[PDB]
């Protein structure tokens, strides 16, 4: 079908965050995921269509951080909102960028925000360009918020938030297809010297 665009996800790895060796201030970034991409988050419809993707975060807003990604090609810091992973201690901070290169890491610090394209953020008409799928990439960093015992510590997986394809094809914008942003859990180690 013309409009047979379906969801997939987007997913990022606790498990790449390096050893957190801790020599406290809070809150401060303790490490870098690997960022991770996906061109087909949104995909399968036959005809061509201009498309942009709505992120809502939905894990708890604890407060803001100031922080310019190694990853990425942004000059100047940024505030971003720090997300409450659940476990004490730990938040995530996101930023998201439409699929190909050129276009920049958007810091997640509103309660919605277009990552694709930027232009939507201040021109409701905006979208990409037209093509036949809708895709992201997806940075994200730790965050210490308070104490971290020594030794390691599991991070469930977590829904950071959903994408909202929208689209200037009424048809295929009012499916209000949405796919989820993943933090998939796993193990990350403190030394405390
Ligand atoms: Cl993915
Ligand atoms: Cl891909
Ligand atoms: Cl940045
Ligand atoms: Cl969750
Ligand atoms: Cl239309």
Redesign the pocket.
Same mark, same amino acid.
């Given at each position: 079908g013309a409009n047979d665009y379906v969801p997939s996800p987007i997913t990022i790895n606790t498990s790449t965050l390096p050893v957190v060796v801790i020599g406290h201030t809070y809150p401060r970034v303790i490490g870098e995921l690997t960022g991770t991409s996906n061109q087909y988050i949104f995909n399968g419809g036959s005809l061509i269509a201009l498309m942009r993707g709505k992120f809502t975060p939905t894990l708890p807003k604890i407060g803001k951080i100031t @922080?310019?990604?190694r990853?990425?090609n942004?000059t100047?810091?940024?505030d971003?909102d720090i997300f409450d992973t659940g476990v004490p201690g730990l938040g995530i901070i996101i930023?998201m960028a439409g699929y190909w290169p050129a276009t920049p890491?958007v810091?997640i610090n509103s309660s919605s925000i277009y990552i694709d394209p930027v232009a939507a953020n201040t021109n409701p008409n905006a979208y990409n360009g037209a093509t036949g799928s809708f895709g992201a990439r997806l @940075?994200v960093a730790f965050v210490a918020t308070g104490r971290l015992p020594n030794g390691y510590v599991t991070i469930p997986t977590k829904q950071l938030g959903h994408i909202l394809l929208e689209s200037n094809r009424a048809s295929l914008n009012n499916k209000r297809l949405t796919a989820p942003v993943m933090l998939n859990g796993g193990r990350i180690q403190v030394q405390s010297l």
């Open positions: @922080y310019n990604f990853q990425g942004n100047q810091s940024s971003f930023g890491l810091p @940075y």
